[PDB]
Amino acid sequence: GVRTSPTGEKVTHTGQAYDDGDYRRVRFSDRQKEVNENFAIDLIAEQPVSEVGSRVISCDGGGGALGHPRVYINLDKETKTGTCGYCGLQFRQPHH
Amino acid sequence: LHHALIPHGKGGRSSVSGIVATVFGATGFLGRYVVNHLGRMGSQVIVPYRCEPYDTMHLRPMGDLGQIIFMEWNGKDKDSIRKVVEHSNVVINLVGREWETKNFDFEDVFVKIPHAIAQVSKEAGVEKLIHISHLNADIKSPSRYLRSKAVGEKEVRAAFPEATIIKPSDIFGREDRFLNYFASMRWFGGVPLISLGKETVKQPVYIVDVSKGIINAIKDPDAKGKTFAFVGPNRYLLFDLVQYIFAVAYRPFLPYPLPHFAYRWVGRLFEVSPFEPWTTRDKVERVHMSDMTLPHLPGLEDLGIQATPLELKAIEVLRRHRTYRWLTSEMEDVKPAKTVNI
Amino acid sequence: DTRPTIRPRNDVVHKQLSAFGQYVAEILPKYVQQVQVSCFNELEIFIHPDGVIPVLTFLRDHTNAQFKSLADLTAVDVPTRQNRFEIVYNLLSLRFNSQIRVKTYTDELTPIESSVTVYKAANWYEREIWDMFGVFFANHPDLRRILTGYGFEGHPFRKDFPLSGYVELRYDDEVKRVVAEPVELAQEFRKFDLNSPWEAFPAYRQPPE
Amino acid sequence: RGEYVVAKLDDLVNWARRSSLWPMTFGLACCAVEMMHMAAPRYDMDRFGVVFRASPRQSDVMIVAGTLTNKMAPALRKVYDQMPEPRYVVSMGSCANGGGYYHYSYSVVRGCDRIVPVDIYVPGCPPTAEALLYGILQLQRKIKREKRLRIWYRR
Amino acid sequence: PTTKPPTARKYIWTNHKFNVSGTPQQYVPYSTTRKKIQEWVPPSTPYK
Amino acid sequence: TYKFVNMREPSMDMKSVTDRAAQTLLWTELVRGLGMTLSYLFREPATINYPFEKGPLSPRFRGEHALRRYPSGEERCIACKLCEAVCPAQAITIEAEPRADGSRRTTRYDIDMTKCIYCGFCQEACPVDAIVEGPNFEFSTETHEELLYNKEKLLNNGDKWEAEIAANIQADYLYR
Amino acid sequence: FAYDGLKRQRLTQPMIRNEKGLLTYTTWEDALSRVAGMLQSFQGNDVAAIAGGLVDAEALVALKDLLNRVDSDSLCTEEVFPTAGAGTDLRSNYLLNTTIAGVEEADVILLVGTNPRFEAPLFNARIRKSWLHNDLKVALIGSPVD
Amino acid sequence: GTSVKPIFSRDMNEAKRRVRELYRAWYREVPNTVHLFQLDISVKQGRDKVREMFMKNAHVTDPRVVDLLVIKGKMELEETINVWKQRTHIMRFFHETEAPRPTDFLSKFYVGHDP
């Protein structure tokens, strides 16, 4: 998804927002402020949470050679669900 | 001042000065140079344009990338001006046609659109305005040029109380339509100056002088509401320029007096051309009109610019009109015209 | 090679070049300060600034050397040395398919008499070493600028000269002519300090100083 | 009305101007040999209606192709000056576009547009021959969308 | 692709577009970061 | 070994000189040229019909850059900052920032097309194949500004050419 | 970790009071014009200065002479050193005459009215190191702080 | 240390002797270069400008250094008279396009935070 600034000015995922005057805005006049509609933060947050019953699970990210450097994230934290750094998708152990 | 408008850099091309110009009708003679001076320290101009972008192509290499934006704008439309002046620290007006047009008249180009841009600029929230008029702009002057300039002048002044006003005497430069206009008279035999042009005095102004005078006025905080007038260092009789610029062009000097009514007849005949007329009745009697000497109005010396002599920067422009037999002739051969002191 | 990763060495050329190093050494003990044959069978003749004609003329006409091919001559501006410049000729021998390197030290002011007489290939090979570095070459036909711009100021290859220089051009429409201004970049050079703090190959480590 | 008549007259001039331009490639660097490569029978500009023409008083579009140095700077501008109108310059390669690989060196002006009014910027290092051919196609499309006679009608 | 359809993704552009240069839906560069040095907010109401 | 290229032995018999005189008088070798080019004309041309057909390319082609994302859709980029460190023209500028989730990616990935030189080192540099550079080459423009690609522009282009580059690295990652 | 404080509520432009008496950003011109007239019209004890917590010695000297150029001597600072006795006269009175690098060899140290854990953490680190090795006897009077 | 090589001149006396006639050449050329290069500046400002760059380095005492600018300055008068340089190459000395740089302490302070 994507939100809109008071000047309309669809705010990108980073949070950029030209304020009211901000003479630099004139470059978007007669043109379009290129913004990617797909926002990474909420486009991965809704992804299903993996349920694997092990303490350590690899996180190659699908297609080991084609994916990302395989990590060995720990699965013992029950407060929150441990996720790969590169992948971002979340691993949780079912009742550990 | 806004956080994004704090000036920086050494006044170079990619330096930021915090001034946001919106020069109007810059696709002309003096609009060319001010933008060139505007891009010197990196002031993002907007330069709304109405002609083909190709004719506006030559303005790109006067500023860093993204510093010279181009916006399509129509004078008759109202929202067209507003769409380019919302985010401008200053607004500079230079719109003006030196001849009559079917779709635009002297009144339309000198009171209609300068008042309109001034009122939206004040409405938008601009901080300054530089509306240029003529030093010779008299409400009851015979020329339609000067009377139209005068009525618009009080119009913009009333619309914008703080609108600094520039009235240069006469502009001479590379394509001034003033020096080259006199040089172009060779193709039509002798010079058709009425009564030998012995009864007309002018004080021309260099482009670099006036164009600089704009942004010194911009950077000066005391220029709000002033009515600066720019004049050259020396005045000269009309017959005193003609032979001088002919001599500095080394063209055959052939003065030829003729009646003014026939001079008007020639001006009207040249107006019938559907394309750009070579001369019009307005400039016919504008040439023989003599500038004032009013000293009460502040000059370019007030801001801190010295008015360069006409004879000094003349070789750059009149060299083109010379033939092969004088293309390499220096200005030592010519001599400065007989200045009329004040 | 039992170790295909490492590059094989050749001692046959190595000590033969070492033998030739002493050969030239004994002939001119007034010029040859230093002779060195590196690991990769490269011979170096460190000479005195006065010797640009004799040793090169020696290396060019001798029966046992026959080095008539001027491969290149280059300077190595080393600030920490009292003689910042280091002019490095390179010679090639058709008869013995070998390469000879000779080095001479120099300050900014000390001149080198031109080697045009020895190698006439060197005519154009000083017009840029004078340009890039600023070492003037004495008694030379022409010392003109051929790499730097017409009337450019400085010697850019000097290690104290900035990457971006000082002058940047732009076509100024006020004067209808390209003109120079003090340089100001759109982005400055994001220099990187990539020298690891842990010592490299200890073979060439500097002695306790 | 007059608008329709002037529209046809503008198109008549438009069609030739977008089909009869004669480029002059100011051969500078490795970008230049690519333009000679799209002179090869593989691409053959001349099938579109453009010919490699020297004497830049005859050419309409001129192509900077490679790095541009201060030494090359003033002469290159003069080539643009007496180049007759209509005149368009196409930036070939990253070095001509924005200095490219030598953007930080002391001797090359960053970007060719600092000297001439670039019309089309063609990215590449080098731009593959047909990528420039694409840029030339874009030039004619831009040439198609002009209102020279139309603007004069409202002038 | 009629015989080897490309792998489907949620984010793949459903409608491919041509080059948009010279047209009102052009691309215009703009800094994507956020302003870091913020001014001291001037307080309001009193004096001395 | 070697061979000579111009050691010529013109035989001075009355026979041979007749050919030499025949060669000079009747422009035989010049006629050879005429018949040579005539055979070329009688052959087909090889001018490809652009844009109705374009040049033959390869899966390893280096073109316009485009940042991609995982099958889940989150950006592959993790701001390891390798690509700009090897970028031979310093066209890659980037600053990482904390993110709300904690998967702190970059707020800036700006590649200057007019400075970049399309070596492809960025692909080899990226450990997660985030920055690849696609097969497109039509990304010409008319203003210098639109070549200063930013994080949004790369992300949009990655979502555009995702159908193509995904198969390209699919058919080439074994080589890499 | 204090670089973030560098980026918070940063004074950026000449901040002067408006017609109401409220701070606004204006050019330099009015800012030093306001100070110039008020400093020249007044003369003597009626003009003075208050030093802060972190000020370079450059600015302290810069207006020490300026305050004297307007005939003022009350150049005051936040922290108070009793002027009774030598005070600012003798350097030793307000000086670590032993030097921080020279505290290791000391045997019995008497800390008076201070909590070096937070007053001078680095100095507390130095005495702790000498405490561990040199086996000195630390002694502080006042609140039983750690 | 003190003993050193005479690149072209032993003594500062002959250093000026190399400056003199080179100035004479760098004095004589002005009317012809201003003529064929087709400039707008007058001869006299060319003359006094020639003085200007003869001035800034009129403060060195090492004979090698001064006569190194002699050959250095020897290296443009022919670069000009054989029309090798350009109009943009000798207007460059006539620094014109930049606004006057600030001289007073107030002007530097107003412009920015840079000595």
Ligand SMILES: NC(=O)C1=CN([C@@H]2O[C@H](COP(=O)(O)OP(=O)(O)OC[C@H]3O[C@@H](n4cnc5c(N)ncnc54)[C@H](OP(=O)(O)O)[C@@H]3O)[C@@H](O)[C@H]2O)C=CC1
């Ligand atoms: N000596 C002199 O000539 C002096 C002149 N002035 C005044 O300066 C002004 C500008 O002079 P200069 O720049 O030399 O003139 P030019 O004729 O060279 O340029 C005039 C500019 O005005 C624009 N313009 C005119 N009418 C319209 C319109 N109806 N809608 C939109 N744009 C319009 C033109 O657009 P486009 O390029 O598309 O035609 C052009 O950009 C004039 O008002 C003139 O009287 C002041 C002092 C002296």
Ligand code: SF4
């Ligand atoms: S852009 Fe690349 S290919 Fe073109 S001239 Fe520069 S370095 Fe060579």
Ligand code: SF4
């Ligand atoms: S190909 Fe990648 S690494 Fe190489 S210059 Fe371009 S952006 Fe930088």
Ligand code: SF4
């Ligand atoms: S694109 Fe790849 S190489 Fe570049 S910063 Fe992101 S993860 Fe690192």
Ligand SMILES: [Zn+2]
């Ligand atoms: Zn993972």
